Nucleic acid binder design. Structure first.
Ligand code: SF4
Ligand code: MG
Ligand code: ZN
Ligand code: ZN
Lengths: 43, 443, 86, 130, 46, 506, 166, 58
DNA sequence: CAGCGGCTCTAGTCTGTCCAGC
DNA sequence: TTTTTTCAGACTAGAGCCGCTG
RNA sequence: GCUG
């Protein structure tokens, strides 16, 4: 079969060196650094 | 049959376009598929898929029918798409059997797909008059005379009644008075008529000139009363044979009657089952003659004599040495002509058995060579696809140094050597495909 | 070691070859039509155009293409010379 | 016993009366020879230096059963012991030919696209196109 | 022609050579055997 | 000027397992190892030839470079090469799949034997959007069930009976079975017109009734070649991944030389076998001898894919046990468990464990020797700059010291002992990495090898002590199930700040 | 000149967490896309604006902050209808070399179309007589990577008359 | 370890090139345990093709 | 009186059997 | 030409079987 | 083979 597996679980993320979605991986992290979607310039 | 699909990708690419090939060839690859599902899987916008199917239903390559879901699943017949390869040959036998007028009738019927009578006679009134003398205008009444004259011998049949389903739209298919009714060409009648040339050339180049003509007049008076699915022709009496002879002949009835019982009793055997079965083996034998010399062709005819008597006689029955012969067997084995050892009955032992006997199987050697000939025209067109895009700089200069012109006449020598050679392998297809269709039940 | 030298051969030459351009005389008739209809099937209405070129072009401007006797008499005959099926 | 023999020297000698064929006219049945071919086999063929001047029908008929596989006449009435109808007729080729240069090459069959043996640049079509 | 292939001591602690015996094996091949002596007092983890 | 070329990295979204067609194998192979049955070590000085050790498919020795690239053993990936099988053979991995396709398809016209009405229902099932691997295996059993139940064909009416894997790597099909009902004329003619064979072999006349089509790799190749494109989905093959013909073997990709520093010996035997059959055909060998050679070549190719191959014939049984490709991916020592799920790890130690009641429950006493060998990489960051310079001055021998320094610009590591330590300390700048020795307050993972619950790995703070032995508080010994009757435990030092924090918090 | 909307994943290393993102991305993106021709796009120059900056992830490895950045950058791409004004920084006998002033010396005019007194005879003769104007005519860029220049132009000079200078 | 993978094929390449779809354009780098590279190579040699789809981190 | 459906049955066969440490 | 050297185990085909199922 |  042309089996397209995604790489999930832990028995594949440990084999493919990709961080697992279980535990710490479930939540992504963001930077609160000073940023904003700013106004552009008039062209 | 992947090489078959290789040609349908090539045949639509040269004729109409590329997306009409793509949506076309995908439909050959995934079959009964709706309109939205085709546009999502090929990655094509829905406006272009409606146009591409519109051209494909016009040239009768994609057929539509709904069964249960109330949603029409289009479906493309594969073997129709390869008949575009035979298109200039379909022109030519309407020039041998009809005039230049009717030859142009099957032409624009093959070109523009579905035609009404009110259009196709109006078009040839333009093309034949512009090549004839102005003031000496070709009168269209003779076209309407030869138009029906094609139809009485049933070379042109009408389109099946349109389903007129809600999903199908009537306005888009016609290209822009009277409506009329549409038809395609009856190319199935040609496959009888191309077979009629095949058997009459099989007898004349084997038996005698006078033997073949009585086969022709037998088959010329058995055209409407049979079909392609007829296992053999309708049975005739010898008295109407003497009535149906051409006026060029002067042979007495009793001498041709001796040739009639001569021609009825042959190894060849009108048995239309045996006729294509004997013509296909000569097509096989002309390929080993083409490829492995007359010595290997001599043992190739030997296995068509005895079914399962091999390797204890083939070193004797052709007298060629054991070293030279056994490389011809294994080359006929490795290229799948010699088929195989279907007689070994000792249990699970390559070393100890009841001695494997070679045996040709005529259809496995047929379907391979048809698959090979499908592969062959892929290598023909792709070369003519190759040599075209470079030389475009000097085609418009005529419309120039000495190597510049010399590349053109070596191009035009090449393309005309390629394009002529697309047709010479094409006659091997039909000679073998009609043999394929003759041994296929329930189709 | 007996074959451990190089790729067997660049190509294998078969001592017997193809016969000719078989059926030489008469396919001059079909052979021109091979090239005749291909001159007319490409230049037909039943083809598609590369509208992806025009959505690729943001340089559209004026003055370029990107910007820009049947002698016969009436009659009516509708024949059923053909099949009455399907 | 005669393994040190070339019957390919004798295949033309049992062929050349069947190429000429005087009286190709169809005045009659033209029921054609197999006994005279056994007659020409026994006393004298076309000339050749032959060690096996002893004439047996069991060693001489075998050159025919090779040459039927080289497209020459079938057996009609060999069920008789020595003399019966024995009808024969040399078969001229029933077809033309059907191949091309690309039908000849076994290894060149592999390709399927521009690859290591791609047909956009094969040697064979380059040779055939001159 | 000669490439040195030395027998090098690899001990985390020093040892004292006690006896070096030179002899010939079944096929004479100059077998050399050395006995290295290390004295260890009982230590935590013995 | 110069174009803008982006430099970036990506993640594996979805592995699509597939095969390669024999033409596709040649496309990725750089050379053709059609060369010597000889090992390729050249006659003098042991250099590579043009065959299996072609150094164009890689290097397994650091001194010799590869030929596709100038990269050394460390920098090279691998390059592939191919061996063109003279007579087509089956793949033991795909053999059961091959027997299944023959049972499903008509042996004569090659369309799957599923009724036109039945085909429509199945095709819709396949169209259902959520076909998980489980569902697909299920349809194949059902579609297969109807077909083995279809002796006749809806396509040509060819009679297709039972395909049953006779012997090892052999497939046998009826076609012409004998039954109490009147025999069909075509089968009767096939079994009754070989008078000469019956006359020559006495055993054939009593056994004349038995005669079934034997499907060998050459017949299968042609049949799989002629299955319709429409009928490849109902064979449950993804057409993009693979197609029925690629199941039978024509060319074998010879492995990159990096993956083989006994598999190479098997490849040489296969090359030798390919030469023997080719020479035998020119020489003029009997079909049984050619079939025996074909069987031996087929067995060698199978012994290459799966060495044990239970059911081996006595005559060709392997002389020694060899590890073929399956015996490299299987077992505890095999790649899947030995090298992937569990891997040998750097920055670890094992010593005997002894008691220390004076240590807090969160601390482990680490021997000063293990502390000097095990190092943690610390980047100069403006708060550790003064502390790092002092440890650089102490150097490798003193316990609060470092064993390597890496500059920000280069990945080169400069050993502190060989060079002048004072100059390096002054040159230290923010962003360079110093491999300081394990120091008090470091986080180490401690693990007892017979791990049975979650508590067998536990983190511990590490406080270096003079005695050599991993000493912990004895309250934490029932999680480890560790008595002190000679036990040894393992220490792991996390080398990243993200790993250190997860160990301390969790 | 033309604006080109582009999207990039810009990685800010963690020692720049003092500065504001929209400035500190802009300092990175100038170092990413200056003096670099993008194939089928043109010669990027600098940053016009950042039209949309989305949220700063931080991945399980680096510890840096990766913000996917939508922006607009001004690029150099003649529209096949521009009469530019450059300078002859070179003369080859096959054709003249014009250069836009300190912009790019990579515009190479072929010269076949001006008045029938045309040759460059290797002694630096500009044109056999009867700032320099230029008509950029075709787009022509070649992607460089090929194994283990790049915006060249072809530049014309029709019968403009050139009233000020010949 | 770092391997170069092509976007179209899904097959590992070397130095930013693929000897398969001889177009460097689609080659991209990936980080993988080196053992997995051996497994993908041994799979590819044995005819099991472990095709890889590469997606940029977001 | 004949057939194929499921049964039902015996054996057949390949598949495992703790972590690691010296 | 002549021994075995663990102990189950829930899959996969055949061999039938008898009886309704036509 | 023994230690764990
Ligand atoms: S051209 Fe293509 S097909 Fe014809 S022979 Fe050469 S390779 Fe085979
Ligand atoms: Mg204990
Ligand atoms: Zn390399
Ligand atoms: Zn690639």
């Amino acid at each position: 079969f042309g089996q397209k597996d995604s790489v999930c679980g832990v028995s594949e993320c440990i084999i493919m060196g990709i961080p697992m979605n279980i535990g710490t991986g479930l939540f992504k992290l963001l930077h609160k650094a000073d940023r904003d979607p700013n106004p552009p310039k008039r062209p | 049959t992947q090489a078959e699909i290789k040609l349908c990708s090539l045949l639509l690419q040269e004729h109409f376009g590329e997306i009409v090939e793509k949506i076309g060839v995908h439909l050959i690859r995934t079959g009964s598929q709706p309109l939205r599902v085709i546009a999502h899987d090929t990655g094509t916008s829905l406006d272009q898929v409606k146009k591409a199917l519109c051209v494909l239903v016009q040239h009768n390559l994609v057929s539509y029918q709904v069964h249960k879901r109330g949603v029409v699943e289009y479906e493309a017949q594969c073997s129709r798409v390869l008949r575009m390869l035979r298109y200039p040959r379909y022109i030519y036998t309407t020039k041998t059997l009809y005039s230049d007028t009717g030859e142009l009738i099957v032409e624009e019927l093959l070109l523009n797909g579905k035609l009404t009578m009110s259009a196709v006679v109006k078009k040839v009134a333009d093309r034949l008059t512009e090549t004839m003398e102005d003031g000496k205008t070709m009168d269209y009444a003779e076209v309407s005379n030869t138009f029906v004259r094609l139809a009485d011998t049933h070379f042109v049949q009408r389109c099946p009644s349109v389903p007129t389903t809600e999903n199908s739209d009537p306005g888009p298919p016609p290209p822009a008075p009277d409506d009329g009714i549409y038809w395609q060409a009856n190319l199935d009648r040609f496959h009888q008529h191309f077979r009629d040339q095949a058997i009459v050339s099989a007898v004349a180049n084997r038996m005698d000139q006078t033997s073949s003509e009585i086969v022709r007049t037998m088959l010329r008076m058995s055209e409407i009363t049979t079909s392609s699915s007829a296992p053999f022709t309708q049975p005739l009496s010898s008295n109407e044979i003497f009535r149906s002879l051409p006026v060029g002949y002067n042979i007495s009835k009793q001498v041709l009657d001796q040739y009639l019982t001569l021609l009825a009793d042959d190894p060849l055997e009108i048995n239309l089952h045996k006729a294509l079965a004997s013509l296909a083996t000569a097509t096989l034998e002309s390929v080993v003659q083409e490829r492995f010399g007359s010595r290997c062709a001599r043992i190739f005819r030997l296995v068509l004599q005895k079914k399962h008597i091999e390797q204890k006689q083939v070193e004797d029955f052709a007298m060629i040495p054991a070293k030279e012969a056994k490389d011809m067997l294994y080359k006929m084995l490795s290229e799948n002509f010699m088929s195989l050892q279907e007689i070994p009955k000792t249990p699970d032992h390559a070393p100890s058995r009841t001695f494997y006997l070679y045996t040709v199987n005529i259809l496995s050697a047929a379907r391979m060579l048809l698959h090979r000939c499908y592969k062959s025209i892929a290598n023909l067109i792709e070369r003519r696809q190759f040599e075209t895009k470079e030389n475009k700089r000097l085609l418009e200069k005529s419309q120039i140094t000495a190597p510049e012109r010399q590349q053109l006449e070596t191009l035009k020598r090449n393309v005309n050597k390629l394009d002529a050679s697309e047709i010479q392998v094409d006659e091997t297809i039909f000679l073998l495909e009609s043999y394929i269709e003759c041994t296929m039940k329930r189709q | 070691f007996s074959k451990g030298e190089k790729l067997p051969d660049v190509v294998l030459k078969p001592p017997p070859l193809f016969p000719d351009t078989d059926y030489k005389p008469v396919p001059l008739k079909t052979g021109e039509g091979e090239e005749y209809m291909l001159a007319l099937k490409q230049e037909l209405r039943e083809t598609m155009k590369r509208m992806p070129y025009f959505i690729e072009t943001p340089e559209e401007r004026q003055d370029i293409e990107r910007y820009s006797d049947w002698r016969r008499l009436p009659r009516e005959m509708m024949p059923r010379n053909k099949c009455k099926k399907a | 016993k005669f393994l040190q023999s070339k019957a390919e020297t004798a295949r033309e000698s049992k062929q050349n009366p069947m190429i000429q064929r005087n009286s190709s006219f169809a005045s009659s049945h033209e029921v054609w020879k197999y006994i005279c071919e056994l007659g020409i086999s026994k006393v004298e063929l076309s000339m050749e230096d032959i060690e096996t001047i002893l004439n047996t029908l069991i060693y001489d008929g075998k050159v025919e059963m090779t040459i039927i596989a080289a497209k020459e006449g079938t057996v009609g009435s060999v069920d008789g012991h020595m003399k019966l109808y024995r009808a024969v007729n040399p078969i001229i080729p029933p077809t033309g030919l059907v191949r091309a240069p690309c039908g000849l090459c076994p290894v060149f069959d592999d390709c399927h696209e521009g690859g290591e043996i791609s047909p956009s640049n094969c040697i064979y079509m380059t040779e055939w196109l001159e | 022609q000669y490439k040195d292939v030395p027998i090098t001591y690899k001990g985390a602690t020093d040892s004292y050579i006690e006896k070096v015996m030179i002899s010939s094996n079944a096929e004479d091949a100059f077998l050399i055997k050395m006995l290295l002596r290390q004295t260890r007092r009982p230590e935590i983890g013995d | 000027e110069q174009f803008r070329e982006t430099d970036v990295a990506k993640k594996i979204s979805h592995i699509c397992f597939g095969m390669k067609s024999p033409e596709e194998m040649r496309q990725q192979a750089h050379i053709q190892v059609v060369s010597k049955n000889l090992y390729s070590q050249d006659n003098q000085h042991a250099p590579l030839l043009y065959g299996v050790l072609d150094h164009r498919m890689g290097t397994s020795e650091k001194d010799r470079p590869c030929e596709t690239c100038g990269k050394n053993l460390a920098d090279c990936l691998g390059h592939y090469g191919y061996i063109d099988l003279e007579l087509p053979c089956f793949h033991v991995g795909y053999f059961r799949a091959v027997i299944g396709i023959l049972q499903m398809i008509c042996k004569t016209c090659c369309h799957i034997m599923l009724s036109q009405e039945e085909k429509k229902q199945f095709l819709d099932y396949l169209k259902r959007p959520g076909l998980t691997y489980l569902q697909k295996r299920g349809l194949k059993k059902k579609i297969s069930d109807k077909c083995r139940k279809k002796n006749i064909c809806h396509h040509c009416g060819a009679f297709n009976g039972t395909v049953k894997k006779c012997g090892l790597l052999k497939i046998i099909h009826e076609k012409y079975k004998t039954n109490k009902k009147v025999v069909d004329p075509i089968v009767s003619n096939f079994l009754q017109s070989f008078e000469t064979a019956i006359e020559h072999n006495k055993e054939v006349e009593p056994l004349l009734g038995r005669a079934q089509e034997n499907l060998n790799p050459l017949v299968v190749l042609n049949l799989f070649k002629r299955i319709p494109a429409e009928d490849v989905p109902l064979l449950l093959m993804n057409p993009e991944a693979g197609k029925p013909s690629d199941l039978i073997l024509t060319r074998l990709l010879v492995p990159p030389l990096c993956i083989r520093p006994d598999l190479t010996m098997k490849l040489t035997e296969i090359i030798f076998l390919n030469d023997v059959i080719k020479k035998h055909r020119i020489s003029g060998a009997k079909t049984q001898m050619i079939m025996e050679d074909w069987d031996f070549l087929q067995l060698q190719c199978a012994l290459y894919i799966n060495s044990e191959l239970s059911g081996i014939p006595l005559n060709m049984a392997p002389k020694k046990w060899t590890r073929g490709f399956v015996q490299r991916l299987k077992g505890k020592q095999g790649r899947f468990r030995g090298n992937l799920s569990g891997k040998r790890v750097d920055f670890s130690g094992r010593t005997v464990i002894s008691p220390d009641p004076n240590l807090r429950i969160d601390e482990v006493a680490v021997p000063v020797h293990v502390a000097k060998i095990l190092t943690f990489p610390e980047k100069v960051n403006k708060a550790n700059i003064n502390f790092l310079r002092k440890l650089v001055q102490n150097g490798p021998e003193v316990h609060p010291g470092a064993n390597f320094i890496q500059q920000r610009h280069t990945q080169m590591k400069r050993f502190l002992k060989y060079g002048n330590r004072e100059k390096m300390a002054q040159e230290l700048k923010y962003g360079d990495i110093v491999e300081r020795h394990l120091i008090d307050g470091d986080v180490v993972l401690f693990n007892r090898q017979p791990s049975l619950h979650k508590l067998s790995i536990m983190a511990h703070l590490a406080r270096v002590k003079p005695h050599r032995t991993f000493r912990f508080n004895e309250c934490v010994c029932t999680p480890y199930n560790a008595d002190f009757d000679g036990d040894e435990m393992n220490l792991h030092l996390p080398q990243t700040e993200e790993a250190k924090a997860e160990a301390l918090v969790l | 000149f033309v604006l080109v909307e582009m999207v990039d994943t810009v990685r800010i290393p963690p020692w720049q967490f003092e500065r504001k993102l929209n400035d500190s991305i802009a300092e990175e993106l100038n170092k990413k896309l200056a003096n670099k021709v993008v194939y089928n796009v043109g010669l990027c120059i600098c940053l016009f604006d950042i039209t949309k900056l989305e949220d700063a992830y931080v991945f399980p490895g680096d510890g840096a902050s990766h913000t996917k950045v939508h922006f607009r950058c001004v690029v150099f791409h003649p529209f096949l209808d521009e009469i530019l004004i450059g300078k002859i920084k070179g003369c080859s006998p096959e054709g003249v070399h014009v250069s836009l002033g300190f912009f790019d010396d990579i515009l190479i005019p072929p010269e076949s179309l001006q008045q029938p007194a045309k040759f460059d005879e290797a002694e630096q003769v500009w044109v056999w007589e009867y700032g320099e104007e230029i008509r950029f005519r075709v787009v022509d860029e070649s992607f460089v990577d090929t194994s283990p220049y790049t915006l060249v132009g072809s530049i014309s000079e029709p019968g403009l008359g050139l009233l000020s200078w010949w | 370890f770092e391997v170069d993978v092509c976007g179209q094929c899904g097959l590992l390449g070397y130095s930013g090139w693929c000897h398969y779809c001889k177009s460097s354009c689609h080659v991209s780098s990936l980080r993988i345990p080196y053992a997995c590279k051996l497994l993908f190579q041994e799979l590819q040699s044995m005819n099991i093709i472990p095709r890889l789809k590469l997606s940029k981190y977001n």
